[PDB]
Symmetry: D2
Subunit: 251 residues, 4 copies
């Protein structure tokens, strides 16, 4: 179904990104993984699916490393057919106590990397007469929260870059869209929850204010939506920002 | 996955409703069709997927008829698991030349019918601890167009009613969402069409950047996605399928 | 600055509508008032500003009554220049227990009256090539809350309607826009607080408790803030505001 | 109405920022102007209003120079009560043909400068419990257009940033909002039009605006300054984290 397509997913050595890669892999895509830490438990996950997978450790706040990432995909599979721009970093502080380097780093990775990714993948998508760009943005690409100046700013920028790129490719078989998740049960959020108290009330205390369902989204939910955007039923979904959020945006 | 579910799709004797009911049918749901005219051709489009289907002719502007439709589903299948609020009607006039009966019927069919359908299906979905309500709205639940006062007003109401209902069922296995299509190849659009390509572009050029139609089958596939496990925490959302309409 | 203009405000015998009419009266507009109750207080308040006011008691769920209201404006002042569609009604219940009648009434007053006011004003605004229609909608025109199926639907429809009219009037000097308030300090809202206060219970705490969930400022929008916005929209700087929905809401929508 | 308040307006040596500054000065704010080119015309327009004014040339893609700009505001006037983050830069190319250099400069100026402005003004506004930060974003902070990847990303980032700041300041007398203009009649855009060589001034404005702005009429810098001034009144006290569009119907379709 995606056999013969090649998906690259940024920040996919674990968490949301690996859940996404997992589903693409299952539907027959070859995989370019990206991320820090040992890339091998993850490579062996994707390969379980009867597919070739590779990993590049690009630090995506460095453009030249983004370039060597895309250069590895060109040499290894003839380029990227599905780009999932997923990697992200966070820092929580009042705007006037926000670390200056956190600002720049968050803008670089959450926003600028997505424009770099897209610019490098889009030529081959157009040439091969088919393409999918899926930016994993956030509810924070649509509304604000106190303490998240840089993240909400970057995620908004992504939502808007999505629209521009969906419009620029409207008359082709390449689509660009954004998924906007609320709370996701990630390795890092799991670790949080693990860090006295009790697991239920830590997770309730996290979700209660913003997320009316009081239940996490999972990586696998997000993976399936990606697969959806990659099907033919996704062909006239263009420049959209779809939220998966347990009611976050509804109120 | 949908075997042993029952889906009621309003406005499903043709076009968008029928393509939706057909996708749900391929996935194995029992189907309740609704709409005007001979239900035979829609019922064969369904029954051939190896499933049970039935039909009720309810005019959805009449509240008692809405009740008769939901009565027929419960007597036939034991309840609605999946409700797709789809039927719609249009009229185009400047606001100050817009016929008053026409305002009232568009509001009744496009807006108030959704609320009635919802309030009749909800309690059963709650009791069975599972449910999907999907409102087929429009890009016109999100933006305006000239000539379309009553429709944009109704479809915006649907978007808002969708948020309320997604919030109220947030802590259950019942979800409520909307799907917001741009230009869709309907039997009524096809009739409009009749080279047919230049017709299609004349129709779509201003509003729909892809110059290509959304299909009822694209929309069925989304509905199907939303009924799946992966749509469990999609709530009160209005997802646009529109060839780039909203991106500009 | 609005001298020579005529404003009609719906639901202006008291509260928000009256606060808006007062600011338009102070800017020089002649005032058509509408609503239930004794109109003597509203008419007195307006008169103070050295302007002419009249009152029509039109039930806005009755299209014939709306027509009579607008007919009064034409004979009295030569037609409406600034239409403020303000009248609102509310009811809270779960969707599945929301009474059918309340659904119809809310839809009729909060949404359909807005279409009727708008259809009746627009021809004379166009003929004079000058006009402002300002719809007082709600944050509930942009997001939901639990228990508010009919209001959120009707207010959303107002926001949609506003776009259609903004668009259809774009090439003329008539504009149509929406204002979308959060919690506004009305006499109804003052009772809520008052009732908490009578419990032995600090009024500020009570006001905090009421606003905390939805309105980060913990402070009310006032009818006067809203009248001042309406007056802005009616200025030359409002000429190219068209089909817009602007929120005044102590932060409600930013989160 | 603004006597004894100090407004700083970035990019106010001409076009939109200057029109905004003029209306604020007319309302009696002291003014800190900023921008490239000869500042004397901009200074002369302010002084016709009878308020004190100074100019700083800070390049807003340089963080140290924006810090100098706020130091001058502090030294001259004791700090900034009304911050208008206006300065804007533009570049049109398909996304895969957008200069990397111009991507970084648009982000720096249209987005990151707004974070720096804000972080530098907000401690003095909180100390004095009164402030207004008003970000001049664009309809492009709400929707896309082809050719405009950087600008659309930056201005959307601004609209998001404004929400966070609105929220962080919600419990204070400091507000933060954004204004989102469509096509604005700027000196630069009059240079486009006055070059239209043989044509019809009327149907060239029309052809420029037809596609995006159904009014076929410009927002003026002066309309924008009047809304800024609104946002500065007691009536804007509970306008918080908002993004109001002034766009001749752009966002309505």
């Amino acid at each position: 179904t995606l056999k013969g397509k090649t998906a690259l997913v940024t920040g996919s050595t674990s968490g949301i990104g690996l859940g996404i890669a997992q589903v693409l892999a299952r539907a027959g895509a070859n995989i370019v993984l990206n991320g820090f830490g040992d890339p091998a438990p993850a490579l062996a996950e994707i390969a379980r699916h009867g597919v070739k997978a590779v990993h590049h450790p690009a630090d995506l706040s460095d453009v030249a490393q983004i370039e060597a990432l895309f250069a590895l995909a060109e040499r290894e599979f003839g380029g990227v057919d599905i780009l999932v721009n997923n990697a992200g970093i966070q820092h929580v502080a009042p705007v006037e106590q926000f670390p200056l380097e956190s600002w720049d780093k968050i803008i670089a990775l959450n926003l600028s990397a997505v424009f770099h990714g897209t610019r490098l993948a889009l030529p081959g998508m157009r040439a091969r007469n088919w393409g999918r760009i899926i930016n994993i943005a956030s509810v924070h690409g649509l509304v604000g929260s106190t303490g998240k100046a840089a993240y909400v700013a970057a995620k908004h920028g992504v939502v808007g870059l999505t629209k521009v790129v969906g419009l620029e490719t409207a008359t082709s078989n390449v689509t660009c869209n954004a998924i906007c998740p609320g709370w996701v049960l990630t390795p890092l959020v799991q670790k949080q929850i693990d860090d006295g108290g009790d697991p239920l009330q830590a997770q309730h205390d996290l979700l209660a204010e913003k997320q009316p369902s009081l239940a996490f989204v999972t990586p696998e939910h997000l993976g399936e939506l990606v697969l959806f955007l990659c099907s033919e039923a996704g062909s006239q979904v263009r420049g959209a920002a779809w939220n998966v959020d347990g009611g976050w945006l509804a109120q």
